[PDB]
Amino acid sequence: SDRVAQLTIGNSTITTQEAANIIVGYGEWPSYCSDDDATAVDKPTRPDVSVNRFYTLDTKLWEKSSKGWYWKFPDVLTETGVFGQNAQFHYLYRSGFCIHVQCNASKFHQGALLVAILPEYVIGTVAGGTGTEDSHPPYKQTQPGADGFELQHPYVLDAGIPISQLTVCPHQWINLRTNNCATIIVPYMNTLPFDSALNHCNFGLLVVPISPLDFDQGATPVIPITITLAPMCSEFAGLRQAVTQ
Amino acid sequence: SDRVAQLTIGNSTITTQEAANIIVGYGEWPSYCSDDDATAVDKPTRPDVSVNRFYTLDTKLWEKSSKGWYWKFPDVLTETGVFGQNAQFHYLYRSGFCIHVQCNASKFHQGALLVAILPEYVIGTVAGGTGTEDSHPPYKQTQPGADGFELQHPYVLDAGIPISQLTVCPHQWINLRTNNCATIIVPYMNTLPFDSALNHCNFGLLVVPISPLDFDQGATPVIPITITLAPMCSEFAGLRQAVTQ
Amino acid sequence: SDRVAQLTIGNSTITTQEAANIIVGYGEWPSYCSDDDATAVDKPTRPDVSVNRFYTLDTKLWEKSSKGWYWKFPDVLTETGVFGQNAQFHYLYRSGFCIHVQCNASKFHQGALLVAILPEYVIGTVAGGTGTEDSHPPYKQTQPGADGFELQHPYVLDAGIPISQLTVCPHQWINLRTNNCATIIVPYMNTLPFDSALNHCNFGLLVVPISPLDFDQGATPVIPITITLAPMCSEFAGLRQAVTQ
Amino acid sequence: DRVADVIESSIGDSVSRALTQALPAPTGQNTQVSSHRLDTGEVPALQAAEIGASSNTSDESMIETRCVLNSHSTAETTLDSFFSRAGLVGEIDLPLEGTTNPNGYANWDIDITGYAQMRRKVELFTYMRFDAEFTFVACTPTGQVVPQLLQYMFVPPGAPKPESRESLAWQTATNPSVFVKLTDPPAQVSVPFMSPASAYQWFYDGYPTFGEHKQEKDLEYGACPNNMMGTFSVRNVGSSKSKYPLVVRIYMRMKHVRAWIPRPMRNQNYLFKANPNYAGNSIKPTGTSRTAITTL
Amino acid sequence: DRVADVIESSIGDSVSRALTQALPAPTGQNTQVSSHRLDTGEVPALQAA
Ligand SMILES: Cc1cc(CCCCCCCOc2ccc(C3=NCCO3)cc2)on1
């Protein structure tokens, strides 16, 4: 009664028989905005089930050389579903997330992925190598949306910070000999009650292979990693026309 | 406390470490005949332990092409043991059964058998192919006894009925990745309190491969299926000399 | 809650995830010497943690032909650690032991070791083959200390006694398909309250392959067996200078 | 009367579930007596890091322990203890001859990300709320104290930023200014937590404008206005050349600190302010290196 | 006054833990009536030598 689990939101149900418990970011369940924490005076929308549900956004292929990937969040779910709509139509957005990363293999494969949530995940550049040039990461790199983006210098998380310490963040590991999925529930984290789903990404999801994938030849070589996630307590306000970015 | 089990009747004990619970046909344990359900006025014999025990009747070899087999019941146990005797010596017979079908393989083999009990399992013929000839199945096919009989058109259970619907009958599956045996307890089912073990077969046992057996070469290729069964609450009346058929 | 276990004495902790319970020799936990069971009037030393702890003494390689090994006990731990010291410095010694023999393999290897404790394990000789010569086993064979000694005629335990009956002694088996370690707790057994750790060996530890080790080629062929043990309730008296033997 | 699913519908629950509680921890936890344990079913030592939680194994479960009454204080590890230490965050030059700041006045954009020591400490957290004590140490480049009068002026964003030593803005009719001689002890003043956000944000993963976000504008990524507190302006009070070359060092001591969401400590050298850029060709290991894992 | 680890310190326990008891056995154990048992979860026959 701990390695098996079932997550159900809206009209979606995830199943798993080799889980490793559930992490609750900074020990706090997603909640709605207090009546004294808020400022925006207009009465918000809380679509509920039409937005708070599981969206299986993408699949990556784990290879013996993979460096690791990341997805910025608020963003990732735009353009997709009714959630995406309320996000374009409304100025203000607020919500928590249930992130379920899955990846399975056989008892004969081996490897370990680090799945973490890094709030305010600001990306950096190599500064032109020499570090004299003040370059800046493009809209394509900072906000890749679904499809995510691959890291180029995971050791420093492409931001000059040691990944070795990334675990001070709500994380969980996917060690093939042990489990086949990570589940992290993240509460709304920002210095404001609401913010724009468009120009601000409350956090990023990192999926990095710390112990490389390996297996003797002949075993299925296609080990995918799929990202499924669900907004929780989504609230929107500041209605206007639909804006893309 | 559910995948392991032990069945003990008479002087026989079956063991299993990969069971899938026990089915009780039409949700009813075998009972003896009511004093108001009966008609035959002679006081019956209830040999008890000498007949209500496990008889391991036969082994079949499951192959990548196997079509499936069946055994008619009352019959199957005649000629074998003290049970067989009381059945030949007495006109009237009555009893329930505990059927335990077993078949194991390795965690590297795969396949799935459907084990069902089909009451009043009347057999049909192909009618000479064209269906113009009114042929009839032989005593060898309708009542094969032990050794059972192989199906020729399992899709219709050699009787013009969809096997796809055979599950409305007390059944159970033997899925190699999951278990290695089926256990079904059947109560006496007939429109009469007692009947002749010889000319009437209250039901048939079907063992059919729905998902074919398969495995990479090098793994032991001999996957047998053994049928073990035990009469329950056997009652006999109408004593005379011993009759074979 | 029975296949996993943790043994902790002094500053040592053994771990195991495929245990087979714990045997307590002759059903008795090691105790200290009664005030009326003793004779030596000097007040003893009970070093406690500095001696009652796990000492991982040696590793043997299990091979498809291995005959089996044994270690005499009191002795084995001399020369090693603070225990060894109190044993050389003091005339009288007394103590129980927690013996943890470990050996693991893969779910694809097979074999079975008999791990037993045979009190007063007197060794014999082949008597010059013909049995006319009254030979005697050397100090090297009777008291091998760590490194143990290999048996030459395990069937008779090199002492004219059937190993088939060795199980009337606190034993335990290491069956690879089932577990990967043996744990036996032995109380002080002698006809005296204290005795010399040097010239007397209260018992011997036998590790014998009854079902030979086997595996298909390609699987790691180096299957070691390691002996770890811890004195319990060690008591010493009769202090003088340090004596080796 | 209602539709039920509306009556239960927990939508609108403003309070968070929690799951953890803050307990008193004035001293380090004491150690209690431990004895040998030889049993099955109980494995402290065994853990499953995959879960994402730190090993809860206690010393007592790994060895026979004595009893120790730990009375070591944990006071010096509080945020206030750790942060309420004045540190250099700004430096302003007011030379006589030069290209930097002649004319006799300067405008320092209030940004503490300019110096490595202080920057790294704060970048330990994602959000920080606090008041601060700003101290201004002025003197000549030689470190000499000179009889010169200065005027410091905090210029909130939106206020007229002085364009010259004699700018009208120095009337400082509503802005808070400070007049000090370099002969007087360094000026020190108390600043509150100004900012429309509830906390300053060291890292802002997003943009602030809502536009096209083309190449040229990637300059605005990570730029969060809730952190731009305005500028700090300084001038030698007068209408003629200073007569002495000056330098002002700005030290900041945080107080009444609250911090949230710890992050990994800075790994590579810093390159620019409000921009985590690192030198791609000089990516060094977090620390020292050996020759083999089997040798010190 | 004492150091605690000295107060618990079970060192010096002269009596043995036991774990077994000798019961009267003047005659061989009798056999009691047994009936059929068809159930899961309970496996007498299965052991782990
Ligand atoms: C009198 C008087 C007082 C002053 C100066 C007052 C300064 C108050 C400064 C408060 C600064 O808070 C900060 C928060 C964040 C950052 C920051 N820099 C990079 C992004 O975050 C800098 C300062 O000048 N004159």
UniProtKB/TrEMBL annotation, chain E:
Q: Where in the cell is it found?
A: Host cytoplasmic vesicle membrane; Host nucleus; Virion
Highest taxon, organism lineage: Viruses
Function of the protein: Protein 2B: Plays an essential role in the virus replication cycle by acting as a viroporin. Creates a pore in the host reticulum endoplasmic and as a consequence releases Ca2+ in the cytoplasm of infected cell. In turn, high levels of cytoplasmic calcium may trigger membrane trafficking and transport of viral ER-associated proteins to viroplasms, sites of viral genome replication.
Q: How does it assemble?
A: Interacts with protein 3CD.
| Homology family | Belongs to the picornaviruses polyprotein family.
Name used for this protein in its record: Genome polyprotein
Shown segment, full-protein numbering = 567 to 615 of 2193
